[PDB]
Amino acid sequence: AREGGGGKRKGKSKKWKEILKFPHISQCEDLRRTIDRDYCSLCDKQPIGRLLFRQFCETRPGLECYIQFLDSVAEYEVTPDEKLGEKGKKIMTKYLTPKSPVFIAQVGQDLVSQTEEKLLQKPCKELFSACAQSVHEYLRGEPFHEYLDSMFFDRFLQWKWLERQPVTKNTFRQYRVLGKGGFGEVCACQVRATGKMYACKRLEKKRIKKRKGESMALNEKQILEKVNSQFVVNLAYAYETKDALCLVLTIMNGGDLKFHIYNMGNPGFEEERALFYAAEILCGLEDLHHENTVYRDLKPENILLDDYGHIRISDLGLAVKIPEGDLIRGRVGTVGYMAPEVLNNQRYGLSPDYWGLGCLIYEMIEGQSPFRGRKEKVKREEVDRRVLETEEVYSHKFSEEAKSICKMLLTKDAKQRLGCQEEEAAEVKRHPFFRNMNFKRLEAGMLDPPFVPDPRAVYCKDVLDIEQFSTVKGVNLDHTDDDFYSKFSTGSVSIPWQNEMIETECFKELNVFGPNGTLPPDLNRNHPP
Numbered sequence: 001a002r003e004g005g006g007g008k009r010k011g012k013s014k015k016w017k018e019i020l021k022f023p024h025i026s027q028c029e030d031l032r033r034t035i036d037r038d039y040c041s042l043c044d045k046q047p048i049g050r051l052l053f054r055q056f057c058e059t060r061p062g063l064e065c066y067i068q069f070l071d072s073v074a075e076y077e078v079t080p081d082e083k084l085g086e087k088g089k090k091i092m093t094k095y096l097t098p099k100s101p102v103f104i105a106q107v108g109q110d111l112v113s114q115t116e117e118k119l120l121q122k123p124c125k126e127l128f129s130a131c132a133q134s135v136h137e138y139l140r141g142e143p144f145h146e147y148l149d150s151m152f153f154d155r156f157l158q159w160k161w162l163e164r165q166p167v168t169k170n171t172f173r174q175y176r177v178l179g180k181g182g183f184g185e186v187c188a189c190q191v192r193a194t195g196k197m198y199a200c201k202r203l204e205k206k207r208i209k210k211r212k213g214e215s216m217a218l219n220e221k222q223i224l225e226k227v228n229s230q231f232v233v234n235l236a237y238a239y240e241t242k243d244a245l246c247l248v249l250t251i252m253n254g255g256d257l258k259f260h261i262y263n264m265g266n267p268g269f270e271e272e273r274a275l276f277y278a279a280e281i282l283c284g285l286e287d288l289h290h291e292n293t294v295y296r297d298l299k300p301e302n303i304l305l306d307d308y309g310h311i312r313i314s315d316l317g318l319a320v321k322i323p324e325g326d327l328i329r330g331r332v333g334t335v336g337y338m339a340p341e342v343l344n345n346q347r348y349g350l351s352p353d354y355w356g357l358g359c360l361i362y363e364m365i366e367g368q369s370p371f372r373g374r375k376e377k378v379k380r381e382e383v384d385r386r387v388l389e390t391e392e393v394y395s396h397k398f399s400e401e402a403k404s405i406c407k408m409l410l411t412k413d414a415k416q417r418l419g420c421q422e423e424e425a426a427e428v429k430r431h432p433f434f435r436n437m438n439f440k441r442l443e444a445g446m447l448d449p450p451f452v453p454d455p456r457a458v459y460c461k462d463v464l465d466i467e468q469f470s471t472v473k474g475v476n477l478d479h480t481d482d483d484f485y486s487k488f489s490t491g492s493v494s495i496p497w498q499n500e501m502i503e504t505e506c507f508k509e510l511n512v513f514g515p516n517g518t519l520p521p522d523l524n525r526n527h528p529p
């Protein structure tokens with residue numbers, strides 16, 4: 001239900017209930033037939049699917065206890081460390097003990113035992129994770145199968161129908177230019193029906209073509225799609241115009257980290273501020289790494305702020321999804337920001353992102369790159385040489401803990417680098433530099449940023465065309481470009497679209513059923529259109 005955006009001069013279109021009008025359920029037969037009935041996707045990962053399955057569960061006493069447990073576990077994870085024994089024991093009594101009325105029997109008895117014991121010792125935020133998966137293992141059975149036959153899944157099919165409607169020229173309205181670079185420019189845009197504000201990243205087809213950037217543009221879209229993170233820009237819509245390809249991303253107008261680091265006039269800022277940014281970047285990094293995707297482009301300009309002062313990683317073009325167990329090569333990135341193992345063309349994993357985190361913390365505190373000056377005339381090959389053969393030094397601006405984490409992230413050997421061990425990100429989160437940071441609360445948006453930005457305002461002439469247009473394809477014998485345009489423009493992206501519907505409360509308002517125990521007319525089979 002909560003606001004956020006580039007400022008909104010115009011709200012929901014007042015015909016929006018017509019625009020988003022449910023199809024009659026009889027028009028959903030094709031969806032019903034083709035849809036992959038997959039529990040995690042339909043009942044968890046997809047935000048409206050999860051809401052509707054939860055609505056189904058609350059009609060059944062036997063199912064609802066499982067949902068309540070899952071919610072309690074969510075509460076447990078954000079509980080302060082010193083109260084975890086209390087919260088954990090309450091969940092034990094309430095849920096995992098047979099005498100309780102809200103007892104859930106499908107969590108295995110030896111799982112309960114293991115959990116009891118882990119709780120007896122020092123409790124960790126992840127205490128109930130095994131019980132949680134056990135619960136989902138049960139819900140994806142008969143409960144799922146009953147949900148699929150309910151009116152709440154019928155209603156999911158109706159939402160999916162709306163989700164998949166084409167993007168057209170009437171989908172969006174256009175506001176000012178936000179910025180310029182890369183293949184194109186970025187402007188504010190707004191979905192008319194829902195009123196949600198986004199950033200439209202406009203890549204010029206001519207510039208993609210001359211630079212041979214098709215693969216990079218396609219890679220960007222496809223990684224964006226598959227990562228859903230509070231700390232990485234999300235992709236809501238991907239579509240075509242006559243001259244451009246458009247990515248409708250999370251609007252982050254707070255300015256980028258390059259600006260904020262060098263705006264002070266005394267570059268570098270408070271460690272408390274640096275710490276907060278670093279912690280969120282790390283979460284963003286862990287979310288990418290969960291997809292076994294390495295970002296490989298970490299630099300201050302690719303980190304953007306929102307009007308709230310939270311950050312997101314942007315510009316995923318150089319990111320690569322690595323096959324499980326594989327390693328990749330290739331020397332990509334920005335000068336001064338590339339890790340030794342990238343520079344030496346070795347095979348590498350997630351490791352460069354951690355080196356990149358080191359650069360960012362360093363530059364945030366010192367105000368300068370570790371291996372370069374900002375005003376400096378120096379050749380690329382010299383900056384590279386510094387990165388391989390010299391060690392950075394640390395001024396009085398660094399606390400001991402800051403110097404330590406930077407040195408451990410800026411470890412040149414990737415094997416010994418912080419966060420590159422078996423613990424992965426967890427090793428970095430537990431570092432003394434972060435000792436006061438509860439990352440679970442951070443991931444849940446429960447901690448306030450120490451700094452609120454002036455939202456960026458650029459002056460720019462351009463009214464640039466972001467109106468959707470599907471060009472006629474195949475005009476030339478060579479249709480490679482055209483194939484790439486068709487591949488790219490898949491329209492709305494499921495999860496962000498659904499969250500948009502929820503956040504703007506289009507979901508809450510539109511999602512309604514009959515007066516009491518009845519179907520609404522759009523679900524009434526006896527009266528088709």
Ligand SMILES: NC(=O)c1cn([C@@H]2O[C@H](CO)[C@@H](O)[C@H]2O)c2ncnc(N)c12
Pocket residue numbers: 178179180181186199201233249250251252253255256301304314315456
């Ligand atoms: N590539 C992106 O995701 C964005 C780039 N800009 C602006 O365009 C500049 C160059 O990309 C940035 O510094 C911002 O001013 C953005 N502004 C708002 N949201 C975004 N999601 C971006």
